[PDB]
């Protein structure tokens, strides 16, 4: 599993709404083009986690909890860390 | 879904009814006794036959998780036991 989660390699988009006030963070990146992920882990994410995969893009995940941006972003990266960890080894 | 079984002195019938009262499917003794030329008199073997029939038809109709509520007295009879046996043998889950 990884730690740093090199965001600069990824793509971030923010989506906010008004009414309860919610701030939604979205992370999108190419799975097969990621050199920061191990070989089996990638293909594992491409199968088990394929539910989050689309034909036009590899991995896209969205999370919203706190009104802040990088908090929800940290939730996204944490989800990434969990998916990678569970793919690598229990 | 419920299973209503009417046992008589001659034949025995089994009906499946939706909440609206409409019959989802039905299996009786007489018709299949005409088709298969099986013994028309009431028997446990015949009950197993129409049980497997109703099973198959319910499986083809996509009917799963069916409720069977026999009367407390005759529920201990071998016929109803082998009815539930023939039904469970179909692969359904009660």
């Amino acid at each position: 599993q990884a730690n740093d989660i090199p965001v600069d390699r990824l793509t971030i988009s923010y989506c906010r709404s008004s009414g309860k006030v919610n701030s939604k963070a979205e992370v999108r990146f190419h799975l097969a083009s990621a050199d920061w992920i191990a070989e089996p882990v990638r293909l594992k994410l491409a199968v088990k986690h394929k539910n989050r995969i689309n034909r036009s893009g590899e991995l896209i995940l969205t999370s919203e909890c706190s009104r802040y941006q990088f908090r929800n972003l940290a939730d996204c990266l944490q989800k990434l860390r969990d998916m990678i960890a569970e793919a690598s080894q229990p | 879904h419920r299973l209503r079984v009417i046992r008589t002195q001659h034949h025995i019938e089994a009906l499946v009814e939706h909440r609206n009262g409409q019959v989802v499917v039905s299996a009786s003794t007489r018709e299949w006794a005409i088709k298969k030329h099986l013994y028309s008199t009431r028997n446990v073997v015949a009950c197993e036959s129409v049980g497997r029939v109703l099973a198959e038809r319910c499986l083809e109709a996509g009917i799963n998780f069916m409720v069977y509520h026999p009367t407390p007295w005759e529920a201990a009879s071998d016929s109803i036991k082998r009815l539930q046996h023939a039904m469970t043998e179909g692969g359904v889950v009660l």
């Binding site: 706190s66 009104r67 802040y68 941006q69 990088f70 908090r71 | -």
Partner: protein, 73 residues
């Protein structure tokens, strides 16, 4: 910060916050501490030092994220 108050790090302190009429008087409050609850922190201005008794997690987060300095006493 947007009101044109004192920018630099050194003079900034609770006293200066008192002079700016932005503080709450606590005459009947014994052992008065100072805490920071996060809000309105989205894309706020940068390079500002803040010295408080105890700052909340999201406060220190928000401040440090934009390059600010959190002083815990």
């Amino acid at each position: 910060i947007d009101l044109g108050r004192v920018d630099p790090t050194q003079p900034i302190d609770l006293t200066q916050l008192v002079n700016g009429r932005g503080v709450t008087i606590q005459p009947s409050k014994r052992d008065y501490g100072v805490q920071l609850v996060e809000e309105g922190a989205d894309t706020f201005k940068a390079k500002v030092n803040i010295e408080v008794q105890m700052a909340s997690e999201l406060a220190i987060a928000a401040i440090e994220k934009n390059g600010g300095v959190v002083t815990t006493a």
